[PDB]
Amino acid sequence: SKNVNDLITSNTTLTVVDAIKNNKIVPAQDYLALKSQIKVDDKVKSGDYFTIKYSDTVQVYGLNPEDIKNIGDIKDPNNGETIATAKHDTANNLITYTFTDYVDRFNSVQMGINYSIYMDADTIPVSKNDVEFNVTIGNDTTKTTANIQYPDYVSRDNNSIGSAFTETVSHAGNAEDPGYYKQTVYVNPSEKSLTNAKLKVEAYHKDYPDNVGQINKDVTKIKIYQAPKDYVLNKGYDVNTNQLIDVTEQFKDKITYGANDSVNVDFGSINNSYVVMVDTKFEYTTSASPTLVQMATLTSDGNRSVSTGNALGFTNNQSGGAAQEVYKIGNYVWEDTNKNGVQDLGEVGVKGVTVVAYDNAAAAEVGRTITDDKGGYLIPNLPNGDYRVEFSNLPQGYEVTPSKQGNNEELDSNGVSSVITVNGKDNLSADLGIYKPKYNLGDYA
Ligand SMILES: [Ca+2]
Ligand SMILES: [Ca+2]
Ligand SMILES: [Ca+2]
Ligand SMILES: [Ca+2]
């Protein structure tokens, strides 16, 4: 219920990554690596939240807005538990993290983040040195800067053009909805006077026979905007359409679909620049290395034609999909001071206990480990199935607490040997509670 930004501290780095290694920083190709270790005050409790905010020059997804899912819940790599659940509000350049009861059940809470974030060209219309990018974790801001250098538009004689994909959502291997993509074309950014100007956009290139792009009247939608004289177009293709005039309806009879995945827009005589947004559906593919290529060409009287285009590769994540799915079990050996067989707030883990997992039906040992400082353990890479977890090497003088108390199998003790079931998720309920009886030395009289 409370903002605890003031109760977290962090050690953070933000570094631009020249992904293509071409010694130029460009929002469409490059990104930012955010890394942080966050410490949370013990006063923090379940339902409290902290924020991560980021400057106007930063966004948390690139071409695929669905990629926002890559920045999610913060989890403990040592015991599998979720520490805080994440919720995005990109309109407010905000990520909010709400703590789970993890922070009630453990002290000395720490979290790590390792994110790839992106440059937002919205406020970077032109090439500019020392553009600042920053991120604010709780109340602590981290900054870095880069020199942004965009490519020139392409021109031949008085013809000029530029283009970029602005959005791509590929669902390769899916036949019913293969996904969609958008390309924006700048026509006549030089603002020359042209006559009989025509734009041709085509998902065709002789060097890329295997091409998932697709342009036809069935699947393609086109919007056209006119920019006023001297208007400075955004070089990152991040277009503020509210500032332009939507003239799509004046082109209704000027748009012609043609052969081999082409569409033609007849501009006639122009002297303004125009922004053409082409939205279309991917073709279905079984390729595993899908390639998209889409070219744009402007012709006009008395000038040589000029062509540009964009290509992108995709990674067919379905085909193969890393040998099915595996999950982890395990998670907690605690000192059950209560002796109630129930994990209570205030009780803590026991280090150095050996844990072994065997496949109940199959055969035997599928994993083994030892509890850490916090009593936590994990056994990774388990398929669905029934497992016998066995605890051993209890510390001298310790006794096993009553098994399966209460009606909550997540908060009880399993006993040194039990069977748990993995099915589509981690099973972290294989826990053991132990206690130390007072020393009972020698005889009594
Ligand atoms: Ca680069
Ligand atoms: Ca207890
Ligand atoms: Ca249990
Ligand atoms: Ca557990």
Q: What is the CATH number of the domain that holds 303?
A: 2.60.40.1290
Q: Are 264 and 276 in contact (CB under 8 A)?
A: no
The count of domains in the chain is 3
Q: What is the CA radius of gyration of the chain?
A: 30
From 151, 172, 190, the end of a domain falls on 151
- Ligand closest to 428 (CA) is 4
Q: Indicate if 117 and 18 belong to the same structural domain.
A: yes
Range of the domain at 308: 152-320
315, 409: one domain: no
Domain boundary among the residues 297, 320, 343 is at 320
Q: Do both 358 and 429 map to the same domain?
A: yes
Q: Are 30 and 148 in contact (CB under 8 A)?
A: no
Cα 406 to ligand 2 centroid, rounded to whole Å: 11
| Experimental resolution (Å) | 2.1
Q: Are residues 8 and 135 in the same domain?
A: yes
d(CA 357, ligand 3 centre) in Å:
15
Torsion of CA 390, 394, 400, 401, to 10 degrees: -100
156 and 145 within one domain: no
Same domain for 112 and 243, yes or no, is no
Same domain, 289 and 354: no
Q: How many degrees, rounded to 5, is the angle at CA 75 between CA 57 and CA 346?
A: 130
DSSP state of 103: H
In angstroms, the Cα distances linking 156 to 190, 279, 304 are 11, 27, 6
Per-residue DSSP letter, 7: G
Query: Do 136 and 156 fall within a single domain?
Result: no
Q: What is the chain's length?
A: 445
CA of 368 to the centre of ligand 2 (A): 26
DSSP string, 44-82: --TT-EEEEEE-TTEES-SS-GGGGGGS--EE-TTT--E
Q: What tokens appear for 364 in the block?
A: 């035997």
Q: Are 127 and 246 part of one and the same domain?
A: no
Q: What is the Cα–Cα distance from 7 to 41, expressed in whole angstroms?
A: 5
d(CA 265, CA 258): 11
Ligand with minimal distance to 389 CA: 3
| 96 plus 202 within the same structural domain | no
The residues, any chain, with a CB within 8 Å of residue 199's CB and separated by 6 or more, are 185, 187, 264, 265, 267, 276, 296, 297, 298
Whole-number Å distance, alpha carbon 409 to ligand 2 midpoint, is 14
In the reported structure, the alpha carbon of residue 110 is separated from the centroid of ligand 3 by a whole-number distance in angstroms of 25
How many Å apart are CA 239 and CA 230, to the nearest integer? Answer: 15
Secondary element (H or E) of residue 389: strand 385-392
Cα-based torsion angle of the residue sequence 143, 149, 150, 151 in order, rounded to the nearest 10 degrees: -160
Last residue of a domain, one of 106, 121, 151: 151
CA of 149 to the centre of ligand 1 (A): 9
- Taking the CA of 150 as reference, the closest ligand is 1
| Separation in Å, CA 389 to CA 91, 327, 420 | 47, 15, 8
Residues 162 and 98 in one domain: no
**Who surrounds ion ligand 1 at CB < 5 A?**
18, 20, 22, 24, 29-30
Instruction: Give 359 Cα–ligand 1 centroid separation in angstroms.
Output: 50
Bridge partners of residue 245, in order along the sequence: 226
Cβ atoms of 8 and 55 within 8 Å: the answer is no
Q: Using alpha carbons only, give the angle 12, 18, 22 rounded to the nearest 5 degrees.
A: 165
What experimental approach yielded this model? X-ray
- Burial code (b: 16+ CB inside 10 Å, e: under 16) for 213-235 equals bbbeeeebebbbbbbeeeeebbb
My answer on whether 386 and 442 are in the same domain is yes
